[PDB]
């Protein structure tokens, strides 16, 4: 702490901090008492933030450590202030993994159909017979890449520079950005395109009669 | 053009402690309402609490919006918009981001990012009509 | 101009069979 | 009026005999002070302190637990109200 | 070759929507984007296409009025003609006919083209005839680029590349920082993606 | 006699539930006379009867396939065990099951019968028109030799509902399935969902369901079903009573709805030695629970006027049952810790509530995430 | 002046009455629990607008909600509430009811955003909005521009001039003054739609088109709510109107006025060819470039939801009909819907740029004149855009 | 004249005994809806569409089990939405169907089983 509180992550208040005991209920004015039952509030539930999901994913990957299992609002505000540092650090680790593994082993993440060995040693040992240099092997590997895999890989485009973590967060984690499925089910909102409205459905008024037809029916207007 | 000043649903940025502050103002109001039912507090004190504690919270929420951007998201779209003065006054940015406050016997706790509940929307609409009338008078 | 043409000619490269 | 708000979590400390009892505009009991009052906040790290000016309503009490950004102190028409 | 390109994928989702992805690899840094943007602009703007530019219903009741025994208006058939896709290589002005003489569906397969034009999708519906009318219409076809502004003019557009994209990826040479370019082309079947890449 | 699967791997993490009986696209068995008809022809007004509904219809149950779908969507695993016709509609129902990821290895496929179609002979007796079944439908006619014993082996809860008791064949098959499941250590869940014929008289239904009820380890009954199996009129007098002079407590002055909590002594005629949990459901508004060792009530809620146009009560009871099974299979302390039981039953409450907010049952069963979200938004954190 | 709210009814005494659900609890046996009450009556009732979705170690009856009593707003227990305002559209005019996410737009502009839709020109090849409120159906039905059937029957014949029904063994001929929605083999119940009108599709109001849009400041040609459009909007007849005098095929032009339903009006300043537009990571050029300084200028965050969810609807092939104040279910409910459907559209289409978790709803986009990305993410959408209709020497 | 908005005709139990005892030219579909029941909102629309599609070639009628509950019980109805298809030939057994069966299953029954 005292040393190495510069650089690395450390508890903001120093460890061994003191704690205090205060007025219990019945020592306090009625306006400064905690109620005898915890009151319902719309705000009772921690707001789901992008910064919480990312800071949890960084904690589980060990890039960061947190005081508890859930990132505080202070920690998420600091992530909000500093996320680009961790993003560029992850992108740099991704460039370095590219340099180490070589393009076959790196980009084979997005070619599930490419079953062959992609290590630099295997690429060399394949060049030493098939005559295909590393580039022709890479063209072939990408020739096995499906369109959907290619669109996912396009996150690695040198102009996009999509976060290596955002490319690999799974659904049950990304869900925590908005806070899981909506409580009111979206199937209530979903409507098909080219659906034609059934104006006889149960959420329309009964068909309005033709005014002349209605007046005639009620014997208010006569024909002959 | 080389940059962009685009605004997104999480480019807006509700001050993080707002929930605690609202819970605070909520709990006090509940206790006072309870004590109003008990006959310890008369209707004028309850009315003045309902106005003033939510005005106090709304003001704090504004006074802590700019520091929050400048310290924790300096390049935030609505931060740059208001602090440079291009469009959106700090009050309008706060009414998107923080809290819309009062116009009225109940507060607007939410903001246009969170959406106004029906009561809040109606109170806002009444304020809008009054504002339009005031502008017309000013022009004449 | 010549370097541009040298960039785009590759798309007209046929390869032997 | 400006509101003085607790800058830290901790325990409020002050000699509440120095200040007069009053009923606030909201019916809450409070202390009304006409002196420079020093209020301690025993936080989790240090004994922070706050200065309260004369002519102000200290809303808090000798040993109350206080939370950061909580209001601790506060520094015509005549209209009918119907019950 | 060191610098090499290949047709990494091709699809034919319809006779009127082909897709092709291409790779070009061992590009140097800053070559891949100079290629990609110029190729994009060529594909989207400098490719030419062939389409019907004029129509002449041989009997016209009025310039704006409905046409008897057809299940849809003259405007709907003019729009269906606008959506016709043609495959010509030769420039210049050309003519064509439809002469359908009974009830049924008139379709692109019924267009009598000149020798230098080909229907890209025979199955494209043009008009519904409920009555045994000797419906004869003349068409005039042009090959051009972009757009251009008694017989009806058709507000047709000569743009066969329906969309294009490119992505640039590090090849991973730590010194030379070579790059891989992918190009993607969606076309009307007037051109295959490879033919559009060549002509671009 | 024994059955061996030849496999030793521990099955899979969310334990399987088997739902036995019939499958219908949506179908309300519990029907009784209601006081307020809306217009007989304008279906545009029957929303008013899904937001101020009959009390027996406040949270309708349905086919056990609804419970299977809801349980799978709440994250569990369900197998549906039953029979369908070889016709297009039996295929549609099996496709509905499969698309909802309900396991259909016990779903047989009669080729010579027409799924929902029951043959009946219309007759006249006492001058009244009557019907008698000439042929039972596929779903009523699953044989005891058509049970999938691998499902009954895997399944930790065997769920059934009393509609199977309206077929003698399905009743015999049910009791064979119960024997098999109990042999494989299963728990028997009996969602009563009394169909119309079983509301005729208390003392006939009580003996009709007697063997099923005494086989069940876990039982779900609506308030109206319990009060019908007990003295319906006694509990009517119980709740229509109002003190002549003064209330015996302050709350009795408030004239609020009577959430009467049946005592264990009143349940004692129905309690039995195998019964690990009885749940009496008063809509989603309350779940009373009873165990050999403790009893209590989970206070729930409903809202349905929040969605006046899109609300529909149907399947809310199936979603409640599915949530109960969903927690029972993954938190069996429900049988032993009262706070745990309450906290987990609040998940069933939330699932029922969400299920009330859309037209259609299968269309409306919530996911696990939506249910837990609603729990954590409705309930104070102390009581999550 | 004003306009009547959607549910308002003129009572038998010339008062304007609104429907309220009545919470009579245990004593009475009411049949219909909707009252209709004028503003004279409805002040003497505690109207709640809250929800019963709150629970505590107490009971639902004692749970407090915001209510209205006399002219005051106040907080009361459900035990005290007399009536509930259950319908979402209850207080809205027709124009305001057609705005999705209206609770996210400054109410000052609710009138303006109403007026915009009342200036929208019917378009050739009208198109249903991806995001709506569900009132486009009511508007189409009650406008009388679609040919509603007058009598049940099987369809006999359908063309541009007439529809023919036969039912109750009697024929009916219905000439069109429209395009037939029924197939010649269809069967029709009495009050169902036969043919769409001008600016309806499928029996929904269809005043505009779903245009692929970015909000970013271009080089001044979108200065203070000017708008750039692609040449494709001229190619596709997307905003081609017919004006009758003889008719003229009015295309969209520089200086034409467009608006979204949120009051985000703008004037077309520039028309750029498809390859000069900004383009998305899927290569598609955007078809308009709005300027984002308008969003806090008129305080309309709802359109960003409409943008994002419209994109989702374009990719999932889903339309959405969001009744107002969905935040009554759940806090952030609208954000949850939008982000959920963006993520579904992403993972179903494998377009990871649609839901970028780092900045959801925004994406990096490229300059079509350069190919470089703009270095900050741009908010993208497929909003529903409507084309609007179109010397004193003074003392000052 | 203004043409009535609904074709499916509500009957009492006695009017139904009359309609079943008397000779019939066409299949009789009897719907045992009840007005509080959710699926019956949908079944009523399916039956209205069937009643248009078949015109006079089918007799589609409905019986509210709020009113005729004991008759529904005697019809062996065990739930709603339920439907009887009664052949015009009085020798054939009637078909009871349960749940929201597809309108195509209704057509199948009426054309091929009645």
From TrEMBL, chain C:
**Where is this protein localized, as stated in its record?**
Plastid, Chloroplast
Residues spanning the membrane: none
Q: What family is it from?
A: Belongs to the RNA polymerase alpha chain family.
Assembly:
In plastids the minimal PEP RNA polymerase catalytic core is composed of four subunits: alpha, beta, beta', and beta''. When a (nuclear-encoded) sigma factor is associated with the core the holoenzyme is formed, which can initiate transcription.
Q: What does this protein do?
A: DNA-dependent RNA polymerase catalyzes the transcription of DNA into RNA using the four ribonucleoside triphosphates as substrates.
Anything noted about its domains? The N-terminal domain is essential for RNAP assembly and basal transcription, whereas the C-terminal domain is involved in interaction with transcriptional regulators and with upstream promoter elements.
Name recorded for this polypeptide: DNA-directed RNA polymerase subunit alpha
Native source species: Sinapis alba
TrEMBL record, chain D:
Record localization = Plastid, Chloroplast
Top-rank lineage group of the source organism: Eukaryota
Coiled coil where? Answer: none
Family statement = Belongs to the RNA polymerase beta' chain family. RpoC2 subfamily.
**How does it associate, per the subunit comment?**
In plastids the minimal PEP RNA polymerase catalytic core is composed of four subunits: alpha, beta, beta', and beta''. When a (nuclear-encoded) sigma factor is associated with the core the holoenzyme is formed, which can initiate transcription.
Biological function = DNA-dependent RNA polymerase catalyzes the transcription of DNA into RNA using the four ribonucleoside triphosphates as substrates.
- The protein's name is DNA-directed RNA polymerase subunit beta''
User: Mind giving the lineage of the organism this protein is from?
Assistant: Eukaryota, Viridiplantae, Streptophyta, Embryophyta, Tracheophyta
UniProtKB/TrEMBL annotation, chain G:
Annotated compartments: Plastid, Chloroplast
- List, for all copies, the residue spans of the domain called DNA-directed RNA polymerase subunit 2 hybrid-binding: 149-390
Function noted in UniProt? DNA-dependent RNA polymerase catalyzes the transcription of DNA into RNA using the four ribonucleoside triphosphates as substrates.
User: What family, per the record?
Assistant: Belongs to the RNA polymerase beta chain family.
| Known partners and oligomeric status | In plastids the minimal PEP RNA polymerase catalytic core is composed of four subunits: alpha, beta, beta', and beta''. When a (nuclear-encoded) sigma factor is associated with the core the holoenzyme is formed, which can initiate transcription.
What name appears for this protein in its UniProt entry? DNA-directed RNA polymerase subunit beta
> What gene, per UniProt, encodes this protein?
rpoB
């Amino acid at each position: 702490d005292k040393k190495l509180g510069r650089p690395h992550p450390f508890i903001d208040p120093t460890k061994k901090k003191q704690i205090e005991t205060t007025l219990t209920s019945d020592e306090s004015w009625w306006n400064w008492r905690k109620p005898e039952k915890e009151q319902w509030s719309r705000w009772q539930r921690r707001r789901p933030d992008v910064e919480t999901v990312f800071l949890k994913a960084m904690a589980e990957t060990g890039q960061v450590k947190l005081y508890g299992k859930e990132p505080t609002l202070t920690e998420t505000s600091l992530y909000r202030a500093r996320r680009h540092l961790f993003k560029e650090e992850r992108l740099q680790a991704e460039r370095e993994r590219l340099a180490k593994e070589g393009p076959m082993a790196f980009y084979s993440e997005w070619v599930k159909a490419w079953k062959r060995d992609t290590s630099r040693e295997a690429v060399q040992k394949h060049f030493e017979e098939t005559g295909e240099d590393e580039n022709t092997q890479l063209i072939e590997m990408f020739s096995h890449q499906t369109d959907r895999e290619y669109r996912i890989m396009m996150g690695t485009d040198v102009r996009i520079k999509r976060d290596p973590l955002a490319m690999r967060m799974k659904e049950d984690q990304i869900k925590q950005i908005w806070g899981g499925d909506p409580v009111y089910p979206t199937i209530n909102y979903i409507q098909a395109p080219d659906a034609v409205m059934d104006f006889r459905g149960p959420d329309f008024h009964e068909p309005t009669p033709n005014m002349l037809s209605y007046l005639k029916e009620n014997c208010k207007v006569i024909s002959r | 053009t080389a940059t962009s000043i685009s605004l997104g649903i999480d480019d807006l940025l509700t001050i993080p402690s707002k929930g605690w502050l609202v819970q605070d103002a909520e709990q006090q109001s509940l206790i006072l309402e309870k004590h109003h039912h008990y006959g310890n507090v008369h209707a004028v004190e309850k009315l003045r609490q309902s106005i003033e504690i939510w005005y106090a919270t709304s003001e704090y929420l504004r006074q802590e919006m700019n520091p929050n951007f400048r310290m924790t998201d300096p390049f935030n779209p609505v931060h740059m918009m208001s602090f440079s003065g291009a469009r959106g006054n700090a009050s309008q940015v706060h009414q998107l981001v923080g809290m819309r406050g009062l116009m009225i016997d109940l507060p607007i706790q939410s903001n246009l990012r969170e959406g106004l509940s029906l009561t809040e929307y109606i109170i806002s609409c009444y304020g809008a009509r009054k504002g339009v009338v005031d502008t017309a008078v000013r022009t004449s | 101009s010549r370097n541009l043409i040298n960039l785009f000619i590759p798309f007209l490269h046929v390869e032997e069979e | 009026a400006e509101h003085v708000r607790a800058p830290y979590n901790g325990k409020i400390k002050f000699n509440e005999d120095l200040v007069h009892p009053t009923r606030t505009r909201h019916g809450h009991p409070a202390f009304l002070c006409y002196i420079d009052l020093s209020v301690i906040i025993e936080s989790e790290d240090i004994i922070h302190s706050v200065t309260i000016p004369p002519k102000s309503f200290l809303l808090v009490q000798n040993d109350q637990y206080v939370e950061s950004e909580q209001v601790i102190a506060e520094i015509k028409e005549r209209v009918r109200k119907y019950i | 070759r060191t610098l090499q390109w290949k047709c990494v994928e091709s699809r034919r989702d319809s006779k009127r929507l082909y897709y092709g992805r291409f790779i070009l690899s061992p590009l140097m840094k800053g070559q891949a984007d100079t290629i990609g943007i110029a190729m994009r602009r060529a594909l989207l703007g400098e490719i030419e296409g062939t389409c019907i530019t004029r129509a002449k219903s041989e009997n016209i009741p009025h310039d704006y009025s409905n046409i008897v025994g057809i299940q849809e208006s003259v405007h709907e058939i003019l729009m269906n003609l606008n959506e016709i896709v043609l495959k010509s290589n030769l420039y210049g002005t050309r003519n064509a006919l439809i002469c359908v003489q009974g009830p049924g569906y008139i379709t692109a397969r019924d267009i009598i083209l000149p020798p230098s034009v080909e229907i890209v999708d025979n199955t494209q519906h043009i008009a519904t005839l409920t009555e045994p009318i000797n419906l004869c219409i003349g068409l005039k076809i042009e090959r051009n680029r972009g757009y251009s502004l008694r017989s009806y003019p058709i507000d047709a557009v000569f743009m066969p590349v329906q969309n294009a994209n490119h992505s640039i990826h590090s090849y991973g040479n730590g010194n030379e920082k070579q790059e891989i370019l992918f190009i993607e082309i969606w076309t009307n079947g007037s051109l295959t993606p490879k033919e559009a890449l060549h002509e671009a | 006699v024994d059955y061996d699967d030849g496999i030793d791997f521990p099955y899979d993490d969310p334990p399987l539930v088997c739902c036995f009986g019939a499958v219908q696209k949506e179908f309300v068995p519990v029907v009784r006379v209601h006081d307020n008809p809306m217009h007989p022809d304008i279906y545009s007004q029957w929303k008013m009867l899904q937001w101020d509904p009959p009390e027996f219809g406040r949270a309708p149950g349905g086919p056990p396939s609804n419970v299977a779908i809801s349980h799978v969507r709440l994250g569990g695993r369900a197998a549906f065990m039953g029979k369908v016709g070889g016709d297009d509609y039996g295929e549609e129902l099996v496709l509905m099951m499969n698309k909802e990821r309900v396991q259909t290895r016990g779903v047989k496929f009669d080729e010579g019968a027409s799924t929902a179609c029951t043959r009946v002979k219309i007759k006249f007796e006492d001058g009244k028109m009557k019907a008698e079944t000439v042929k039972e439908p596929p779903e009523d006619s699953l044989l005891a030799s058509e049970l999938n014993l691998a499902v009954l082996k895997e399944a930790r809860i065997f769920h059934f509902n009393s509609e199977v008791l309206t077929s003698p064949t399905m009743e015999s098959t049910l009791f064979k399935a119960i024997q098999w499941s109990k042999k494989f250590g299963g728990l028997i869940f009996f969602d009563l969902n009394l169909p119309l014929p079983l509301w005729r008289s208390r003392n006939e239904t009580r003996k009709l369901i007697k063997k099923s009820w005494d086989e069940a380890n876990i039982i779900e009954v609506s308030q109206q079903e319990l009060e019908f199996l007990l003295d319906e009129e006694y509990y009517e007098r119980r709740r229509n009573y109002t003190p002549q002079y003064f209330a015996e407590d302050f709350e009795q002055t408030k004239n609020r709805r009577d959430y009467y909590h049946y005592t264990p002594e009143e349940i004692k005629p129905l309690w039995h030695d195998d019964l690990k949990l009885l749940v009496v459901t008063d809509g989603t508004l309350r779940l009373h629970y009873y165990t050999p060792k403790f009893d209590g009530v989970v206070v729930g809620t409903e809202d349905v006027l929040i969605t006046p146009f899109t609300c529909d009560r149907t399947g809310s009871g199936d979603a409640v049952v599915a949530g109960i099974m969903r927690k029972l299979t993954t938190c069996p302390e429900m049988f032993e810790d009262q706070d745990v039981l309450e906290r987990q039953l609040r998940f069933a409450v939330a699932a029922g509530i969400i299920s009330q907010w859309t037209i259609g049952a299968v269309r409306g069963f919530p996911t696990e995430s939506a249910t837990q979200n609603l729990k954590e938004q409705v309930y104070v954190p102390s009581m999550w | 002046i004003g306009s009547l709210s959607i549910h308002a009814r003129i009572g038998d005494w010339g008062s304007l009455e609104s429907p309220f659900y009545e919470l009579v609890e245990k004593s009475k046996k009411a049949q219909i629990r909707m009252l209709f009450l004028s503003p004279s009556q409805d002040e003497y009732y505690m109207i709640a607008a809250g929800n019963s979705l709150a629970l505590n170690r107490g009971i639902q009856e004692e749970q407090v909600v915001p209510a209205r009593y006399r002219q005051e707003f106040l907080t009361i227990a459900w035990e005290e509430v007399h009536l509930r305002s259950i319908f979402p559209f209850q207080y809205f005019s027709i124009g305001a009811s057609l705005i999705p996410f209206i609770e996210h737009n400054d109410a000052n502009r609710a009138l303006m955003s109403s007026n915009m839709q009342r200036q929208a020109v019917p378009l050739s090849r009208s198109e249903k909005c991806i995001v709506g409120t569900g009132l486009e159906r009511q508007v189409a039905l009650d406008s009388g521009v679609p040919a509603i059937a007058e009598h049940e029957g099987k369809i006999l014949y359908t063309d541009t001039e007439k529809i023919i029904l036969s039912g109750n063994e009697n024929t009916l001929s219905i000439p069109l003054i429209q395009k037939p929605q029924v197939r010649r083999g269809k069967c029709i119940k009495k009050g169902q739609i036969l043919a769409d009108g001008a600016a309806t599709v499928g029996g929904e109001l269809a005043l505009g088109k779903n245009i692929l849009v970015a909000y970013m400041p271009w080089e001044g040609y979108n200065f203070e709510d000017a708008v750039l459009i692609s040449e494709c909007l001229v190619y596709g007849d997307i905003y081609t109107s017919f004006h009758i005098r003889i008719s003229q095929k009015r295309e969209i032009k520089v200086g034409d006025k467009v608006a979204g339903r949120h009051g985000n009006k703008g004037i077309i300043s520039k028309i750029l060819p498809r390859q000069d537009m900004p383009y998305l990571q899927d290569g598609r050029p955007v078809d308009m470039v709005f300027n984002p300084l308008g969003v806090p200028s008129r305080m309309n965050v709802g359109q960003i939801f409409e943008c994002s969810l419209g994109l989702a609807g374009s990719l999932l092939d889903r339309h959405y009909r969001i009744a107002p104040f969905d935040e009554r279910y759940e806090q952030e409910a609208s954000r949850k819907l939008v982000f959920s459907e963006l993520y579904e559209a992403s993972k179903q289409t494998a377009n990871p740029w649609v839901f970028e978790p780092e900045y959801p709803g925004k994406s990096r986009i490229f300059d079509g004149r350069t190919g470089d990305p703009f270095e900050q993410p741009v908010i993208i959408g497929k909003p529903y855009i409507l084309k609007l209709i179109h010397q004193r020497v003074g003392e000052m | 004249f203004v043409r009535e908005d609904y074709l499916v005709r509500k009957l009492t139990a006695e009017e139904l005994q009359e309609l079943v005892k008397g000779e019939r030219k066409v299949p009789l579909i009897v719907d045992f809806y009840a007005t509080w029941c959710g699926p019956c909102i949908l079944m009523a629309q399916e039956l209205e569409m069937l009643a248009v599609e078949y015109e006079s070639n089918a007799m589609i009628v409905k019986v509210d089990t709020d009113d005729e509950y004991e008759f529904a019980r005697d019809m062996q109805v065990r739930g709603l939405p339920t439907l009887f298809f009664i052949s015009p030939d009085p020798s054939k057994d009637a078909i009871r169907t349960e749940g929201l069966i597809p309108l195509q299953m209704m057509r199948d029954i009426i054309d091929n089983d009645m």
